[PDB]
Amino acid sequence: DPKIVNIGAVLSTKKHEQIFREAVNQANKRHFTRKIQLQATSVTHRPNAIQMALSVCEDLISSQVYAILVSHPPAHLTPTPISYTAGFYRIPVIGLTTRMSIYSDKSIHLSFLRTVPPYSHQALVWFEMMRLFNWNHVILIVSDDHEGRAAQKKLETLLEGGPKADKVLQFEPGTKNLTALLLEAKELEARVIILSASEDDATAVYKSAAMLDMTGAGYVWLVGEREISGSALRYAPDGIIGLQLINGKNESAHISDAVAVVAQAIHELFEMENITDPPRGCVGNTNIWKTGPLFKRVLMSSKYPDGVTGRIEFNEDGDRKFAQYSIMNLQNRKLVQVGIFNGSYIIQNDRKIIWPGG
Amino acid sequence: PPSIGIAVILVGTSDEVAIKDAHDFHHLSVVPRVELVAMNETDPKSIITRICDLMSDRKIQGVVFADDTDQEAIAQILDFISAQTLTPILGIHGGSSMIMADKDESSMFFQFGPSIEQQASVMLNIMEEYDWYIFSIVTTYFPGYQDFVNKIRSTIENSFVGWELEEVLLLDMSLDDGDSKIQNQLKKLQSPIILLYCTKEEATYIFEVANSVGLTGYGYTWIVPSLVAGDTDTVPSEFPTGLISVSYDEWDYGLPARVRDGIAIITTAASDMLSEHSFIPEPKSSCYNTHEKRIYQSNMLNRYLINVTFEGRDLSFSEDGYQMHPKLVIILLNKERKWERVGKWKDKSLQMKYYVWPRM
Numbered sequence: 001d002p003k004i005v006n007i008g009a010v011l012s013t014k015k016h017e018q019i020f021r022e023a024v025n026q027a028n029k030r031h032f033t034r035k036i037q038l039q040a041t042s043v044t045h046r047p048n049a050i051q052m053a054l055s056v057c058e059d060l061i062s063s064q065v066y067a068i069l070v071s072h073p074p075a076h077l078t079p080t081p082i083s084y085t086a087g088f089y090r091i092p093v094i095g096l097t098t099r100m101s102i103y104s105d106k107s108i109h110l111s112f113l114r115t116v117p118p119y120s121h122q123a124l125v126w127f128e129m130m131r132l133f134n135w136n137h138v139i140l141i142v143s144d145d146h147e148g149r150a151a152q153k154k155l156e157t158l159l160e161g162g163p164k165a166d167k168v169l170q171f172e173p174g175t176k177n178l179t180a181l182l183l184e185a186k187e188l189e190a191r192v193i194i195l196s197a198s199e200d201d202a203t204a205v206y207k208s209a210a211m212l213d214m215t216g217a218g219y220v221w222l223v224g225e226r227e228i229s230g231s232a233l234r235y236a237p238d239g240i241i242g243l244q245l246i247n248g249k250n251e252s253a254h255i256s257d258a259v260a261v262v263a264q265a266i267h268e269l270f271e272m273e274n275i276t277d278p279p280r281g282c283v284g285n286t287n288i289w290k291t292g293p294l295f296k297r298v299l300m301s302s303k304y305p306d307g308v309t310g311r312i313e314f315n316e317d318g319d320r321k322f323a324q325y326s327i328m329n330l331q332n333r334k335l336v337q338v339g340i341f342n343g344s345y346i347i348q349n350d351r352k353i354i355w356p357g358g
Numbered sequence: 359p360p361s362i363g364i365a366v367i368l369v370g371t372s373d374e375v376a377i378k379d380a381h382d383f384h385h386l387s388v389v390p391r392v393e394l395v396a397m398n399e400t401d402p403k404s405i406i407t408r409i410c411d412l413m414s415d416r417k418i419q420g421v422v423f424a425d426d427t428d429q430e431a432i433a434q435i436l437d438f439i440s441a442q443t444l445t446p447i448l449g450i451h452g453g454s455s456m457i458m459a460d461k462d463e464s465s466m467f468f469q470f471g472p473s474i475e476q477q478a479s480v481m482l483n484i485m486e487e488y489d490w491y492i493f494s495i496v497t498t499y500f501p502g503y504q505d506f507v508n509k510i511r512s513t514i515e516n517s518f519v520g521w522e523l524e525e526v527l528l529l530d531m532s533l534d535d536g537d538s539k540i541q542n543q544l545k546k547l548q549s550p551i552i553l554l555y556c557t558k559e560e561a562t563y564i565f566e567v568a569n570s571v572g573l574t575g576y577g578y579t580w581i582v583p584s585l586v587a588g589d590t591d592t593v594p595s596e597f598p599t600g601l602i603s604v605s606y607d608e609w610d611y612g613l614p615a616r617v618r619d620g621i622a623i624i625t626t627a628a629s630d631m632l633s634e635h636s637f638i639p640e641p642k643s644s645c646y647n648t649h650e651k652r653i654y655q656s657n658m659l660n661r662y663l664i665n666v667t668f669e670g671r672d673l674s675f676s677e678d679g680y681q682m683h684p685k686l687v688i689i690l691l692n693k694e695r696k697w698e699r700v701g702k703w704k705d706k707s708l709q710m711k712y713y714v715w716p717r718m
């Protein structure tokens with residue numbers, strides 16, 4: 001009989017729980033499991049944060065989970081309570097579909113990896129596009145929140161580490177009518193505009209930019225995913241270019257890849273000596289899982305090349321590397337894929353890009 | 359006057375009798391009905407279920423919390439509970455009062471003890487007193503470390519004094535140290551003064567490593583904040599004699615007096631709001647229904663909680679949730695491995711015991 005090693009998961013539906021079970025079952029078939037054998041333990045999201053935190057203790061940590069997969073529910077319910085409660089013990093949490101950049105902050109989320117990249121990493125794709133289409137002068141407009149500043153920081157790092165940002169403009173989140181801000185951008189000579197903003201904030205920008213005739217010929221608009229989503233898409237100027245993370249919302253796909261990565265890391269962990277078990281339950285336990293930090297390092301440096309969502313590696317923030325994006329272009333008010341970022345390379349397809357105006 | 363429920367939660371041995379004594383000298387618009395509660399555990403579940411049970415079995419307007427641990431996580435658990443239930447919580451002693459940087463936007467959690475920025479400035483005052491102008495900084499990723507470094511940098515770059523910040527080390531204690539990474543980072547240190555921002559548990563490991571590479575002996579002076587010294591009756595063996603710490607762990611401001619001030623703050627704030635709006639926030643009937651009743655709740659009571667004066671003493675909190683004017687005590691770990699009073703920080707002025715540091 002082998003040593004049973006529980007893996008935890010907080011997932012959207014029972015359908016996804018079963019997918020998690022089968023994924024762990026396959027890992028056990030795939031691996032040599034005479035010594036070590038994985039067991040799946042899962043719940044679905046609780047209706048509020050406090051209940052969710054308690055469930056992590058009662059349902060997962062009570063089973064001595066070595067790690068916890070977490071999906072982003074699609075219905076105000078974040079992985080945060082799970083990151084917190086697990087982080088208390090240094091039990092690693094693997095985010096499946098959460099994109100917000102704040103989860104890359106080690107101070108707040110001190111044992112958190114994810115198989116999808118934060119929105120801010122869309123700057124990586126923008127940069128390659130600026131090289132490709134030789135946009136050597138760009139204007140960067142970002143919302144003055146964590147996400148907006150995260151994108152600015154990431155792009156500026158790439159630019160300071162060729163093309164240059166002629167100016168950066170920040171606006172207050174929730175500001176309808178941004179004429180003042182956009183007038184400042186209009187003056188400048190550069191006419192390639194990059195935007196990071198929430199759905200509603202992007203809508204405001206788009207509308208104001210239209211009244212200022214900055215969405216016509218001569219201009220280029222390069223944005224991310226939130227900015228061509230929902231209501232933002234409703235008022236987006238034709239010719240705009242945006243992004244869509246391939247498989248970004250496929251919880252099933254990420255469960256597969258995450259389980260594979262965790263299984264591989266666990267078998268690698270037990271090659272080392274002096275591996276201690278995670279605490280059984282929360283009650284009466286206030287010490288960290290001593291082996292937690294080691295297991296985090298092992299996960300961080302895990303490589304899974306043949307993943308459903310592509311090549312799986314993590315950067316120094318535990319964020320997904322080699323993510324794949326659909327390069328979208330709004331033509332005749334229809335989102336059209338004009339290429340993909342395959343993780344390291346831009347690949348233009350045979351569909352021709354139509355810029356703002358032309 | 360109507361009565362508001364205030365739960366006072368005590369973790370670890372404590373003179374309940376002496377605590378009930380230091381406390382109905384209220385002739386306000388509202389009077390406190392306090393309830394002493396003993397707790398044995400300080401894990402997430404125990405703390406959450408306990409406070410939630412209190413809130414469902416009784417009408418709690420606010421919580422006064424005190425523990426005897428060095429567990430800074432407790433503060434972070436309380437802030438979470440506070441924000442989610444929108445209930446005022448005062449961390450007045452122990453881990454509950456250990457600096458909690460970046461409290462939630464909806465938090466109503468307030469702590470006794472100095473802010474990060476104030477401690478940083480107190481340290482520079484100490485260094486100025488003894489003309490220690492050359493130093494380096496070591497922090498972990500423990501929340502607040504940026505505020506600490508920034509505060510230091512902001513102060514010294516805006517002064518004509520010859521400060522020389524040589525090195526700033528950022529240690530990642532979320533990964534293991536089998537590759538001797540932290541040892542390699544510490545070996546870069548050369549300054550005679552080292553400011554260390556981290557937790558008590560983190561400090562004990564960092565000192566162990568620092569000792570191995572000869573950075574704790576004579577010639578090196580380390581200065582840490584309150585939460586590293588924590589409970590000054592518990593002195594890890596890795597802590598180097600000569601360690602200096604800003605502290606607030608119960609020297610002149612006893613637990614009884616704190617519990618009495620905590621009850622006062624909450625009660626006064628409710629009285630003030632009632633006298634101005636003719637209503638106070640209704641105690642949450644449960645934690646397990648917060649998602650529904652959030653459009654009906656608010657951290658309105660905060661604006662009153664931070665501006666209370668009692669018995670002619672200003673008990674104001676910062677908007678960041680810290681004590682405004684705490685009398686801080688500078689302490690030194692002496693040859694007998696005992697923490698020793700060696701200065702006081704009062705009226706934004708530093709009064710040190712020694713002009714020249716005796717030998718430790």
Ligand SMILES: *[C@@H]1O[C@H](CO)[C@@H](O[C@@H]2O[C@H](CO)[C@@H](O[C@@H]3O[C@H](CO[C@H]4O[C@H](CO)[C@@H](O)[C@H](O)[C@@H]4O)[C@@H](O)[C@H](O[C@H]4O[C@H](CO)[C@@H](O)[C@H](O)[C@@H]4O)[C@@H]3O)[C@H](O)[C@H]2NC(C)=O)[C@H](O)[C@H]1NC(C)=O
Pocket residue numbers: 310311342343344345
């Ligand atoms: C995203 O897209 C990129 C680019 O298309 C992919 O990266 C390429 O991956 C392919 C493998 O499919 C590599 O092809 C190999 O190139 C080798 C030589 O590479 C040198 O020269 C190229 C061209 O200048 C440079 O880009 C590169 O940096 C090197 O300097 C060849 O030697 C290989 O041939 C060998 O294998 C074949 C089998 O197919 C045999 O038939 C041959 O005999 C020989 O043994 C091969 O052609 C290519 O080098 C990669 N390019 C770059 C830029 O890295 C990514 O793989 C793709 N990502 C994903 C996730 O799909």
Ligand SMILES: CCCCN(CCc1ccc(Cl)c(Cl)c1)C[C@@H](O)COc1ccc(NS(C)(=O)=O)cc1
Pocket residue numbers: 053084085086087088106107108109110402431434435438498499500501529530531532533557
């Ligand atoms: C803002 C809330 C943070 C929560 N915290 C875990 C503790 C805690 C807090 C709230 C709850 Cl509800 C629970 Cl259950 C548990 C995680 C984080 O605050 C850890 O704190 C530190 C961060 C970094 C370091 N240093 S490092 C990254 O080098 O190892 C040390 C501690």
Ligand SMILES: *[C@@H]1O[C@H](CO)[C@@H](O)[C@H](O)[C@H]1NC(C)=O
Pocket residue numbers: 250252253254256308
């Ligand atoms: C999601 O990924 C799975 C593979 O795990 C695949 O079977 C399915 O077709 C994908 N769904 C979508 C909508 O792409």
Ligand SMILES: *[C@@H]1O[C@H](CO)[C@@H](O)[C@H](O)[C@H]1NC(C)=O
Pocket residue numbers: 273274275
């Ligand atoms: C861990 O190492 C210690 C030596 O200090 C040894 O006593 C113990 O058996 C080891 N355990 C494992 C599982 O390696």
Ligand SMILES: *[C@@H]1O[C@H](CO)[C@@H](O)[C@H](O)[C@H]1NC(C)=O
Pocket residue numbers: 396397398
């Ligand atoms: C704490 O322990 C003491 C005795 O050790 C016991 O009397 C008390 O009931 C315990 N408190 C709780 C909340 O269980």
Ligand SMILES: [Cl-]
Pocket residue numbers: 057058062281282283403
């Ligand atoms: Cl439990």
Ligand SMILES: [Cl-]
Pocket residue numbers: 338339348349350351352353
């Ligand atoms: Cl194309």
Ligand SMILES: [Cl-]
Pocket residue numbers: 396397398399404
């Ligand atoms: Cl208890």
Ligand SMILES: [Cl-]
Pocket residue numbers: 437438441442462
């Ligand atoms: Cl919170």
Ligand SMILES: [Cl-]
Pocket residue numbers: 455456457471472583584585
């Ligand atoms: Cl502190």
Ligand SMILES: [Cl-]
Pocket residue numbers: 428429430557558559560
């Ligand atoms: Cl600690």
Ligand code: NA
Pocket residue numbers: 103104105106109111112113317318319
């Ligand atoms: Na991370």
